[PDB]
Amino acid sequence: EPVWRSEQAIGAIAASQEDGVFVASGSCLDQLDYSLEHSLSRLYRDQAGNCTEPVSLAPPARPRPGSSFSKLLLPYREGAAGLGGLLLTGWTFDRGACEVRPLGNLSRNSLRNGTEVVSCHPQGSTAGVVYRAGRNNRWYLAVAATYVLPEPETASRCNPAASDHDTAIALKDTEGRSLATQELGRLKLCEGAGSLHFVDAFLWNGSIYFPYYPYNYTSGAATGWPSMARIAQSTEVLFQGQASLDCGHGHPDGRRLLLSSSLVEALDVWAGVFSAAAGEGQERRSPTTTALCLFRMSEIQARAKRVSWDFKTAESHCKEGDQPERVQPIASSTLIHSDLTSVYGTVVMNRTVLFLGTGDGQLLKVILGENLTSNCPEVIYEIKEETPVFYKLVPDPVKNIYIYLTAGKEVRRIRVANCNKHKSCSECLTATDPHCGWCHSLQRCTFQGDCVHSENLENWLDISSGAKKCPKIQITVTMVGSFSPRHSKCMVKELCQNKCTCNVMFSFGSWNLSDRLQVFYIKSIEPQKVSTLGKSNVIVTGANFTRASNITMILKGTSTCDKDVIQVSHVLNDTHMKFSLPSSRKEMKDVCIQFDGGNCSSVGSLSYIALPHCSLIFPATTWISGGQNITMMGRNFDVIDNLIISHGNINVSEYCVATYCGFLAPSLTNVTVKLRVQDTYLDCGTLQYREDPRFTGYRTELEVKIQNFNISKKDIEITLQLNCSFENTILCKIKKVRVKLGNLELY
Numbered sequence: 001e002p003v004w005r006s007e008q009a010i011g012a013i014a015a016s017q018e019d020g021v022f023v024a025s026g027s028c029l030d031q032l033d034y035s036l037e038h039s040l041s042r043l044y045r046d047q048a049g050n051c052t053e054p055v056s057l058a059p060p061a062r063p064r065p066g067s068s069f070s071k072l073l074l075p076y077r078e079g080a081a082g083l084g085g086l087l088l089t090g091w092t093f094d095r096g097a098c099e100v101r102p103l104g105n106l107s108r109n110s111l112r113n114g115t116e117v118v119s120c121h122p123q124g125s126t127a128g129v130v131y132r133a134g135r136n137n138r139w140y141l142a143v144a145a146t147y148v149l150p151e152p153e154t155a156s157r158c159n160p161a162a163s164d165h166d167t168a169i170a171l172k173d174t175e176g177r178s179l180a181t182q183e184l185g186r187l188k189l190c191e192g193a194g195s196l197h198f199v200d201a202f203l204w205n206g207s208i209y210f211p212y213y214p215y216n217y218t219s220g221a222a223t224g225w226p227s228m229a230r231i232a233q234s235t236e237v238l239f240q241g242q243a244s245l246d247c248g249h250g251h252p253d254g255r256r257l258l259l260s261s262s263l264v265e266a267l268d269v270w271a272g273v274f275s276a277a278a279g280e281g282q283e284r285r286s287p288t289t290t291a292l293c294l295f296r297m298s299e300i301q302a303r304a305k306r307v308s309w310d311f312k313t314a315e316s317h318c319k320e321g322d323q324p325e326r327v328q329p330i331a332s333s334t335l336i337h338s339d340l341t342s343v344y345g346t347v348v349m350n351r352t353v354l355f356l357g358t359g360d361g362q363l364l365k366v367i368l369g370e371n372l373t374s375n376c377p378e379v380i381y382e383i384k385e386e387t388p389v390f391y392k393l394v395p396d397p398v399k400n401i402y403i404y405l406t407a408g409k410e411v412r413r414i415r416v417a418n419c420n421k422h423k424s425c426s427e428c429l430t431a432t433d434p435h436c437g438w439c440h441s442l443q444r445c446t447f448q449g450d451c452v453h454s455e456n457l458e459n460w461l462d463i464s465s466g467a468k469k470c471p472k473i474q475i476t477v478t479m480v481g482s483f484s485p486r487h488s489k490c491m492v493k494e495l496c497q498n499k500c501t502c503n504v505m506f507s508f509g510s511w512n513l514s515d516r517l518q519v520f521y522i523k524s525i526e527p528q529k530v531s532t533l534g535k536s537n538v539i540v541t542g543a544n545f546t547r548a549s550n551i552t553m554i555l556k557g558t559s560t561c562d563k564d565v566i567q568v569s570h571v572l573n574d575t576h577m578k579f580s581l582p583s584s585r586k587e588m589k590d591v592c593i594q595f596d597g598g599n600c601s602s603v604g605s606l607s608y609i610a611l612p613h614c615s616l617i618f619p620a621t622t623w624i625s626g627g628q629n630i631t632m633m634g635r636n637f638d639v640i641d642n643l644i645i646s647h648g649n650i651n652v653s654e655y656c657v658a659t660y661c662g663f664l665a666p667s668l669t670n671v672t673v674k675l676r677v678q679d680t681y682l683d684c685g686t687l688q689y690r691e692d693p694r695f696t697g698y699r700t701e702l703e704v705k706i707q708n709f710n711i712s713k714k715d716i717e718i719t720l721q722l723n724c725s726f727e728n729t730i731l732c733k734i735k736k737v738r739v740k741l742g743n744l745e746l747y
């Protein structure tokens with residue numbers, strides 16, 4: 001689990017074919033080894049050495065588009081004959097400058113500079129892709145960006161000249177001086193829809209696609225349909241069409257933000273993570289706001305009509321004609337989810353694998369079925385801090401069993417398949433994980449490369465064989481399935497034979513095997529933040545809760561995973577009933593309640609929550625007398641059942657909200673406190689108890705002298721304006737006097 005922590009939040013990341021992993025964090029761009037251990041080299045773009053962000057960037061609402069300083073960062077020409085690869089990096093600084101440079105030692109001279117290539121607005125979108133075009137097949141760079149943002153301050157003037165005001169897509173040339181854009185190599189804009197935010201750019205079937213969506217950077221709300229603009233893969237912009245993408249299924253007003261994109265290459269299927277406006281961070285965060293939608297590139301390629309809806313065309317006016325066709329996703333695959341942030345699709349052993357990154361630090365992968373039907377996603381890796389996953393996942397190019405998860409300011413290299421939990425064949429083959437296969441020589445569920453050391457390929461049994469094709473005992477007893485060796489020995493108890501041979505045992509040269517109608521009203525439901533371990537007692541308040549025999553609660557979190565259907569635990573007062581929810585995965589499940597018979601009554605959202613990890617303990621030491629409200633800062637404290645103080649246990653109260661919570665130190669000594677939730681106990685540092693401090697008094701004004709404890713004003717009560725400092729004793733001054741400290745009251 002090798003991690004690389006930057007200092008400022010990651011702005012971009014790419015992975016070269018053989019030159020390491022480039023990560024653009026703040027003002028500086030680092031290159032690392034594929035193990036993310038040592039920054040082989042580093043470039044400073046703004047000022048030497050000091051690579052702090054010149055200005056402050058507000059990390060906005062997870063649905064809202066982020067902001068960074070490194071707009072473009074993409075390697076190309078790599079794997080050439082003799083020409084070392086190139087890296088094209090474009091920054092916000094210097095009017096959106098962009099430099100080509102040698103892919104490798106970063107501190108080498110930039111070959112060609114260039115200005116106004118990428119958007120110079122830190123929150124403006126930019127997405128680029130290089131390709132081959134021209135009579136001599138030069139390397140061009142198609143860049144779609146938000147050049148003009150209506151936020152120019154008279155100090156510095158980013159927004160390009162009045163001629164290039166409405167420019168969205170430009171076909172730069174990586175050879176010409178300063179990356180020159182032709183006259184016709186640019187795609188104009190319609191000035192009505194607010195701005196456009198481009199998410200991606202990729203090549204498919206001789207064309208470039210730019211998935212975007214209209215957007216109001218001032219307001220923060222999408223102002224139209226997420227769309228895809230399709231351009232001919234040439235030297236001059238040949239606008240070939242534009243098509244809206246309709247992924248608002250399962251949500252009232254629809255999903256109009258495009259959070260991330262990825263083209264599943266060998267499948268010709270685009271895969272996009274859409275979301276609806278989730279208020280301010282998480283206030284309208286519903287169980288169905290985000291949705292992974294899969295589109296057939298053929299349908300987008302066919303349905304995109306050249307209409308002047310968002311981009312100026314030479315044959316119409318802005319929104320004075322047709323409206324763009326709405327392309328419908330592959331219906332059997334759309335995966336709804338409360339918080340999705342990024343997607344990356346690939347194909348392994350002729351099976352689509354879509355890794356997804358959720359807004360709470362989960363990387364979970366789905367494996368599409370036969371007719372591209374999605375399975376319920378397995379959670380691969382979880383970030384302990386639940387930081388929203390950066391919207392791009394990059395697969396390790398040199399070892400195809402890794403992927404580089406970026407989150408906040410930390411990058412890490414995580415395997416793509418958590419197949420160590422499978423202990424048998426069936427566990428390894430019914431899960432239908434394409435990366436994982438059973439291994440006889442090791443008798444373990446593992447990757448391919450980790451067990452193809454014996455040259456007989458059938459040693460590592462994969463899924464394409466089928467789950468039934470592992471060895472088993474057959475009755476006249478024999479071995480069935482696919483074994484590695486053709487020589488074994490059978491022994492039953494007590495006939496034995498050898499080899500393909502004949503309690504039961506089949507032993508091989510490397511392994512072995514052995515076997516011997518009224519109304520119904522719902523006031524509310526509490527709590528609404530159940531920890532992942534479930535909750536034994538969920539109280540639903542309402543009315544007439546006794547006029548029914550079979551009352552059920554149905555929770556649905558993920559449009560692919562099944563539903564949690566439960567019966568009422570013990571029907572209390574006709575106004576109150578009580579349920580018991582089981583363990584699940586971190587999610588925000590919808591809760592309907594269906595009585596004896598009828599439609600579900602959607603009581604409201606109900607969010608499972610990660611276990612409470614304990615960050616810090618504010619005082620961290622108090623007098624053996626105690627009584628000081630120790631404050632604990634952490635995450636997900638609202639779901640805490642209660643607290644334990646183990647040394648003998650001591651029950652103590654709690655006064656808490658989501659992130660932090662306090663409690664009077666009751667020990668009356670190094671004690672360990674533990675959050676208990678649903679019969680489980682997690683640790684929280686250690687509180688130490690020492691003797692009460694000694695005092696000396698003097699004197700409007702009052703001066704006191706005391707010989708570890710971090711005493712502060714609200715801790716002390718002096719009745720007749722405290723200010724203290726250590727001078728060694730330690731003197732504290734305030735302008736029949738009484739002083740209360742914890743539980744000790746004296747003078």
Ligand SMILES: *[C@@H]1O[C@H](CO)[C@@H](O)[C@H](O)[C@H]1NC(C)=O
Nearest residue numbers: 047049050051052053054055
């Ligand atoms: C780095 O540069 C930024 C420019 O805004 C400045 O605010 C910061 O103090 C500098 N830090 C150091 C260590 O030079």
Ligand SMILES: *[C@@H]1O[C@H](CO)[C@@H](O)[C@H](O)[C@H]1NC(C)=O
Nearest residue numbers: 039040041104105106107108
């Ligand atoms: C990169 O080039 C500089 C320039 O001399 C050199 O000092 C440095 O050692 C080089 N680093 C690598 C990793 O090639």
Ligand SMILES: *[C@@H]1O[C@H](CO)[C@@H](O)[C@H](O)[C@H]1NC(C)=O
Nearest residue numbers: 045099109110111112113114
């Ligand atoms: C920008 O372009 C000029 C023109 O060649 C060059 O001198 C300068 O080094 C370039 N800047 C960077 C950061 O490469």
Ligand SMILES: *[C@@H]1O[C@H](CO)[C@@H](O)[C@H](O)[C@H]1NC(C)=O
Nearest residue numbers: 150193194195216217218219
């Ligand atoms: C939406 O965009 C328009 C044009 O950019 C702008 O005038 C308007 O102020 C934006 N919305 C809000 C609420 O400001």
Ligand SMILES: *[C@@H]1O[C@H](CO)[C@@H](O)[C@H](O)[C@H]1NC(C)=O
Nearest residue numbers: 205206268297298299301302
């Ligand atoms: C590729 O583009 C051509 C150009 O018209 C089109 O006819 C063809 O259908 C496209 N390929 C696919 C798989 O749709």
Ligand SMILES: *[C@@H]1O[C@H](CO)[C@@H](O)[C@H](O)[C@H]1NC(C)=O
Nearest residue numbers: 539571572573574575576577
């Ligand atoms: C019903 O009993 C529960 C406890 O079992 C209590 O909290 C609630 O207030 C009671 N409601 C009525 C209407 O009696």
Ligand SMILES: *[C@@H]1O[C@H](CO)[C@@H](O)[C@H](O)[C@H]1NC(C)=O
Nearest residue numbers: 617618619620709710711712
């Ligand atoms: C010292 O006391 C202050 C007073 O609030 C507290 O915030 C802090 O956590 C204590 N411990 C330190 C500074 O190590």
Ligand SMILES: *[C@@H]1O[C@H](CO)[C@@H](O)[C@H](O)[C@H]1NC(C)=O
Nearest residue numbers: 628629630631655662663664
């Ligand atoms: C301790 O502090 C918390 C918040 O910091 C507060 O809610 C709690 O009531 C305090 N306890 C005492 C005994 O002052």
